[PDB]
Symmetry: C4
Subunit: 252 residues, 4 copies
Amino acid sequence: YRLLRQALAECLGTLILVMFGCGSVAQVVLSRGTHGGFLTINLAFGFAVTLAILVAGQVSGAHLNPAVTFAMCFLAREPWIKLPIYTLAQTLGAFLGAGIVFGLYYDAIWAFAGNELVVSGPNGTAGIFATYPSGHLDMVNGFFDQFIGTAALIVCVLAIVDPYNNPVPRGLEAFTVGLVVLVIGTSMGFNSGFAVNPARDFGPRLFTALAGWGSEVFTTGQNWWWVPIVSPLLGSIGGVFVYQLMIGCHLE
Amino acid sequence: YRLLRQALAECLGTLILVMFGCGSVAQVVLSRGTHGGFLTINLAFGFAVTLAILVAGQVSGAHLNPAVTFAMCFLAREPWIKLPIYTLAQTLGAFLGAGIVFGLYYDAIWAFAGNELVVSGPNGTAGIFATYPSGHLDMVNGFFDQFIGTAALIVCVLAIVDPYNNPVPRGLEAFTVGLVVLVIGTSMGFNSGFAVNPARDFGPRLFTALAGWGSEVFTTGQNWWWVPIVSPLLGSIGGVFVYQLMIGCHLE
Amino acid sequence: YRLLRQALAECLGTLILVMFGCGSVAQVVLSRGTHGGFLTINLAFGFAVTLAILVAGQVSGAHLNPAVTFAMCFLAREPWIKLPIYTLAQTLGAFLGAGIVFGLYYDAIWAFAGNELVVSGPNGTAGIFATYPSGHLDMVNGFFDQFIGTAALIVCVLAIVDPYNNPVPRGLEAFTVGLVVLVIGTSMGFNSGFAVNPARDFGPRLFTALAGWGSEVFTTGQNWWWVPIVSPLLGSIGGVFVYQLMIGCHLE
Amino acid sequence: YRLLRQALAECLGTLILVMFGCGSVAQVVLSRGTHGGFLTINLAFGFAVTLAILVAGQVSGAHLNPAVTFAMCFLAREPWIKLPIYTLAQTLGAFLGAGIVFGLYYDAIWAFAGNELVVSGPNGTAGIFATYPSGHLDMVNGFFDQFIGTAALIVCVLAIVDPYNNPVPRGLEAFTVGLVVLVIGTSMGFNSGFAVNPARDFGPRLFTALAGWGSEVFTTGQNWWWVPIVSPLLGSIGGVFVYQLMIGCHLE
């Protein structure tokens, strides 16, 4: 089955970027102001996308993003049957990647607040895997951060993918997408990294619910859990319209 | 219309680098010494140029700089009709990119000084979008910073563009220009990023005048607003003469 | 002898990355919080692998890692006779590279604790060349760090090496492997750099035993010296199985 | 004259890297602990070499280093007549590049110690352009830093240049050399950047003698001025022998 081989590549690809991305976030969170800052978090997340694409690019096209997968299906470039398979394959692997990060820092995570698992607060460890609203990053303000961030990601992704452009060889397509992830994190008000990925958010968040953080990861921040899922999906639609209206529709 | 399609690519390209570049500047300015320093500002601005060129390189040549556009027209490589169209397309998109950054940090910008918009000072938010003279960066000292900075940018741009050189494939022409932007910011005494772009300066500055900062953005620093426009234009002329006298005129 | 020429390339390649990698570690350790942090250590180690591969890639394939060499021999891609020759050639050169770093910082290393050589502690200089357990990086916790780290390295290495993929040209195979080394150090809880290399660990550690640190470098941390040797070897086996089960076995 | 065109490319190439490299050093020195650290100095110097090579690579081969030029002449790859012409062309342009940096920071340099120019000390500004011995970087210790640093630079340069290797296309030869410069600065105990270049050292040092710092720049540190000239020259000879004995002589 061709679809099965593409799904396994998406599972391994999302496993690489989540394990590498959330692993660097664990170092900064657990070692408060000692192992680096936000620059290392975005550099690790940005470079992890480059490595993840190179691993699974030749098999499944290296989407590693349900918002990106939704964009190609919306543009009639890929069949709609690939969307549920890729999304489950992208979510399963971010769940697995979060488990590896949990195993790596099992003692440090459990010792952050003594012998308890705290979701949000000063000694909060659930923010390593998922994203939670900040002081100026509430639901209203944070919703537009994912919308604009994902729209910019889709525009840059479609620029290097459109067949009407030059056939960029292998290698100069993961560094570019990895550059977009690094710049988006540095530009937007998100300090977790790769916030424009619904699978990178819901996957590890679902793991934290079963890891021992309880159901509070889904009923906190005025039910914020669905925002990093719906908002990037809307941004993919907006990013597609922006690219098509400006560049896409004029390439005869 | 071919010129219309090239103008739309220049508008989207300047939108990407301004929104990404000024977004990182907003993080450092609003979060004083928390989200990074000048290294992240120049890295984001330098990488944003790489992404912006890759998006619009195959359509309009990816100038994204009125000084760069003036250089090609001066060297008789492009028609003079493209200069007013590209400049307006480069300015419109830096205006739009500044509006997106304003929407992203609307609450944080307005809360920097309580409920007021301050142009310059300790709690100054107008410096996120435009550039203003510093203690050692006055009109006399700052004028030569744009002249030398733009001249070095034009020399590096003409080196990878001259047809007498090797036909560099797609991909190794945005990273190089993006490298020049990053090095120029690190070398020159500008902490805003990409100061050698007249569109990146006048565009967001014009937005701040209508955003709520008043007309003080145009009548401050002994009328500094015209310096980051005329000085890079003179640097493009000087950079063209430097490259032609040393390398350009000797390529038979 | 073809095998002799490949061994000499492996010796020089491991010499470059060890001398460059451990040299940056010496700057941070000796200049406590002055010459940079962990970001510079991983950047130097990651970029040193890129330079080392480019130097010896065209001769011996640029393994520079006994775990990587074990993976290719396990996958029947290289003869088993190359494993003992490459491992000795990789160990000899990390021993030589450590001697160069020792000569560079001979006065600073000896003056860290007055006129004595201390293996572990506050004024510990043996950690520049080798790796020692930390507070949360004991034998049990540190063993899985090398296992997961090396498994991720093998998966990324096999992705760009498998003949069934695109023939990536020279240049886009050292930056990718160098990216993996940089990301692994930023993700995993190791602050020394390139901890997934048995030769980079045992080589300089053997040098410190004869340099003047005594035999305490081999009988400290509950005999930790063998962990960064056996654990990456097991990770190479696990990394091979992960890549083959997900991607490798499905490429007809 | 072919030699005249190659000399003009070497003059412009050394002008780019010196002006960009020393400009970042001026920011860190004048703004004490505000504009960055040693990481930005090595990143700017490393990336400046990449830009300088791309500008003058197609004309003069982009040596930009008398030690590198001496290596090719020693290996009988280039005529010996090119050595005096390239060295003068490399020195003239580092002298010019230092003058541009002086003009950029004329007020800040003169105001470091009031209205005086101090060569060495706390308020020392002559270290921006040239290199001076540190506490642990005296003549005996600093001599071996240039020897090992230049030997590693020559080995990496000869690896990507030898015709027996793959014909690396344009673009993947300036980033590699620029990587070597960045790693060498991070590894070695030099905080100025690109210390393995005799032209980058003597050029700006000669400018400081006539700029107003007096003749003390040549009679300080027990006559240290000749060390960053002779020592890299010896390192080029050692680096050539290392590469030839290990890799060079075995490529039939």
